[PDB]
């Protein structure tokens, strides 16, 4: 923001004393660039280092951040503070130089917590749906004219950014449990969408540790804080009594404080009713598919109602919600002519979902709203570390499609565990794909006339997804 | 605050959603009344309970608070939240009633931490000297026109209150380690005056757990926060590398960032020089006696200059500093003619000091500012546990006065412990052969015992925490009249 706008912000949100320059080790890592963007527009000097340039680093350069594409001691020269992502190891030369220079070195969530200090924090937590729900909450608050600052793990499509500084007092942020780092956050209101077995390497195989961590998180709320929680989830339902804070539940369940019902999906949209205490029933048109996003919308409405945001504003925001990057992201509809040679249309939907539940929810959402269609899926499983523990669930879920293609397990490190391979899975109709450069060629002999291709998983399948959109499916 | 004042404040410090009514179990003491007063002026509904009325409860009534003089389940009705002092047992009827009604119950520090949440918190922690230092810090900030809200453990004389709500974003508060509750606080700046063995029960008798607790407290500071710590304290000097936050040190030590030099005490006033980085030596006149108060002042100055407060304001505040209730508190100088016939006077000074170090500091201050007076002390030990643990130290410092009178131990909830009596201690002191202590078994017969030992040029120190406070005030109004 310009110097006059910033001065106005400073009368409500103070600067961090003596913090001139902030350096980010891994600035294009998950959630790093977003904080950096907010800090750039608050007027701090921003620098960062990453090995892999991307759209995020590109955005950061435009905002005036000096970005380095290597790791060397000089990169932290002059920094007030160094912020490291979870990906960065203790040996990294930038960390080592920071300690030698006695420059404070902090985790991503510590810095996020400082953004929350003199703001009204709304932390969106849970195993799945965090990104979407966070986006829905910031959509509502923006529509209400409250101009919130938000930090999202995904690209908020209506805003073209992962994160944005607002002139408001509000902070709306996705809260990461994957490394227990969300325990740094001190919000006014917290959402817990669900709790499921994922990122277990940080809780050492004990699911009871994960439940406790979520409880500890919710215990960060002030005595008058509010937890907004999905009662449909059986683990949340049993954890309720251990929550020492005011709680408003949501879900399809009959006892839920905010209750969903009359749900039906018509194409890309969902139509349902929301029952709230002291309110006339609310008929909702949601610009998002699947009853999982209905739950996501209910959470957001629960928060907005507690804020006392006008209902029309809630309804306009949800009706025109533009989604997030790679979350059931519809890229286009393409003629089956310069590819295959038939007649009709094949659809392209991009999704980040990497956990059986996410994947299942995508199939469930494709089937409803587009019932007379051929379900084709390109699926890149994420980490051997993950594919082993959920071997059973992956096979049981992925089989629900029509035809299916699979890529080789994205490593991100973690040496290949034999038997956790893609080849192992695509036997337990499936068809493997080894060549990443030739994907439209693999896809050609399996496209009918009325199709919906579904590109699934995290990894680099996102780069292979945009390509398959660039070429309009022309196998070259 | 009036309606519009409050609306302004609410642009920076929001109200706590859905908290209408705040009830205080033990509203009369601690820094409990102070919090109630701040919250009263923020326009919340305030209620509280305590066993005896006092000036604190009067003020709160005048501010529109409902105060009950008892502990019954009814006292808690319609409360959004119940706040309890460390002086309240967990089975107090009001606490049990509150849990029964599903009303959130929180400790004093948790509520203090809520006051600090959206403010720029400055916490003054340490074993001794907290009340004085936080008063000194709030004087400098008030002087500088920063209008801080503050919550002190003692009455701030210049203000006439323990605590005041200001329009600024600053919160200046005394932090309590005695029950480890200061871990709730999330300050921007933290002073640690000193770390010494007291309240050792809550630290399982282990002095290492106390040190670690201070370290954990300091770690509540954000990466850009500051620790202001007294380096003259060997335990503090030892802990420095474990802190992990920007820290500036102070003290008479050579390696101190804010160094005190050239200390002379003249009567009730301290004179000394403060050395700070990229700053000319500062020549301070402090309106407080003793080396210990020059250190407290240095702590306050370190914070103020970090804040970038104008040096002239710093010096104005230090020079006109009015002190705090029961902290080397001058109550008057009375003629001896109508008390024991004799000619001349006896000065009366009230002091809260309950720990040997504190008692020693009061003695040293009396000595240096009035060397030729006959130093008389009325002392009352606080608790038996403390008396047991620090026995030899009590004997060492208490024998430094010319005349010692001693009341029975004020148990403050504790059961008697054999060997840790006032009479135990009096035998020990007697054995040292310098003074012959007089027991005062009836707390109302004080002026009776006091008259005979007054000579004509005396300074009476009334010394100890609570109970003896009443006696000090009685001696002032009767003007020492031996009846
Ligand atoms: Mg995850
Ligand atoms: Mg104490």
From Swiss-Prot, chain A:
Molecular function terms, GO-annotated: ATP binding; magnesium ion binding; protein homodimerization activity; UDP-N-acetylmuramate-L-alanine ligase activity
Keywords, ordered alphabetically: ATP-binding, Cell cycle, Cell division, Cell shape, Cell wall biogenesis/degradation, Cytoplasm, Ligase, Nucleotide-binding, Peptidoglycan synthesis
NCBIfam families for the chain: murC (TIGR01082)
Temperature dependence: Optimum temperature is 45 degrees Celsius.
Protein's name in the database: UDP-N-acetylmuramate--L-alanine ligase
Variation of activity with pH: Optimum pH is 8.6.
Pfam families: Mur_ligase, Mur_ligase_C, Mur_ligase_M
Main localization (coarse): cytoplasm
Residues reported in the UniProt entry to bind ATP: 126-132
Pathway listed: Cell wall biogenesis; peptidoglycan biosynthesis
Gene3D superfamilies hit by this protein: Mur ligase, C-terminal domain (3.90.190.20), Mur-like, catalytic domain (3.40.1190.10), NAD(P)-binding Rossmann-like Domain (3.40.50.720)
Gene Ontology terms describing biological process: cell division; cell wall organization; peptidoglycan biosynthetic process; regulation of cell shape
PANTHER family associated with the record: UDP-N-ACETYLMURAMATE--L-ALANINE LIGASE, UDP-N-ACETYLMURAMATE--L-ALANINE LIGASE-RELATED
Species whose genome carries this gene: Escherichia coli (strain K12)
Its biological purpose: Cell wall formation.
Cellular component terms per the entry's GO annotation: cytoplasm
Catalytic activity: UDP-N-acetyl-alpha-D-muramate + L-alanine + ATP = UDP-N-acetyl-alpha-D-muramoyl-L-alanine + ADP + phosphate + H(+)
Compartments where located: Cytoplasm
Documented EC number(s): 6.3.2.8
Family to which the UniProt record says this protein belongs: Belongs to the MurCDEF family.
């Amino acid at each position: 923001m310009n110097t006059q706008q910033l001065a106005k912000l400073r009368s409500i949100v103070p600067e961090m004393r003596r913090v001139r320059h902030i350096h980010f080790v891994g600035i294009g890592g998950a959630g790093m660039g977003g904080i950096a963007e907010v800090l750039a527009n608050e007027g701090y000097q921003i620098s960062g280092s990453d090995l892999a340039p991307n759209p995020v680093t590109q955005q950061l350069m435009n905002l005036g951040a000096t970005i380095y594409f290597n790791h060397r001691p000089e990169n932290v020269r002059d920094a007030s503070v160094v912020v490291v992502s979870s990906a960065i190891s203790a040996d990294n030369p930038e960390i080592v130089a920071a300690h030698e220079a006695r420059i404070p070195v902090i985790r991503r969530a510590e810095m996020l917590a400082e953004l929350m200090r003199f703001r009204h924090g709304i932390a969106i937590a849970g195993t799945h749906g965090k990104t979407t729900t966070t986006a829905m909450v910031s959509s509502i608050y923006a529509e209400a004219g409250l101009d919130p600052t938000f930090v999202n793990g995904g690209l908020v499509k209506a805003a073209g950014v992962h994160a944005r500084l607002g002139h408001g007092r509000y902070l709306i942020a996705e809260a990461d449990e994957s490394d227990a780092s969300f325990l740094h956050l001190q919000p006014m209101v917290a959402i817990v969408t669900n709790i499921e077995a994922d990122h277990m390497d940080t809780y050492q195989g004990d699911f009871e540790n994960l439940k406790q961590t979520f409880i500890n998180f919710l215990h960060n709320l002030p005595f008058y804080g509010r937890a907004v929680m999905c009662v449909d989830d059986p683990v949340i339902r049993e954890l309720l009594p251990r929550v020492g804070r005011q709680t408003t539940t949501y879900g399809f369940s009959e006892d839920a404080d905010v209750r969903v019902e009359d749900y039906q999906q018509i194409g890309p949209q969902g139509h349902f009713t929301l029952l709230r205490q002291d309110k006339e029933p609310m008929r909702v048109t949601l610009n998002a598919p699947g009853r999982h996003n209905a739950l996501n919308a209910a959470a957001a409405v629960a928060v907005a109602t507690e804020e006392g945001i006008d209902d029309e504003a809630i309804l306009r925001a949800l009706e025109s919600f533009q989604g997030t990057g790679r979350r059931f992201d519809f890229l286009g509809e393409f003629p089956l002519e310069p590819v295959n040679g038939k007649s009709g249309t094949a659809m392209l939907v991009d999704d980040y979902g990497h956990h059986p539940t996410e994947v299942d929810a995508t199939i469930k959402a494709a089937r409803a709203g587009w019932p007379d269609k051929n379900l084709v899926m390109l699926f890149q499983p994420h980490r051997f570390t993950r594919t082993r523990d959920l071997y059973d669930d992956f096979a049981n879920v992925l089989t629900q499609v029509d035809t299916l293609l699979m890529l080789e397990v994205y490593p991100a490190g973690e040496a290949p565990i034999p038997g956790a391979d893609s080849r192992s899975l695509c036997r337990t109709d499936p068809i493997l794909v080894p060549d990443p450069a030739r994907v439209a060629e693999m896809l050609a002999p399996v496209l009918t006339g009325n199709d919906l291709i579904l590109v699934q998983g995290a990894g680099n399948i996102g780069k292979i997804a945009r390509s398959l959109a660039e070429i309009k499916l022309k196998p070259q």
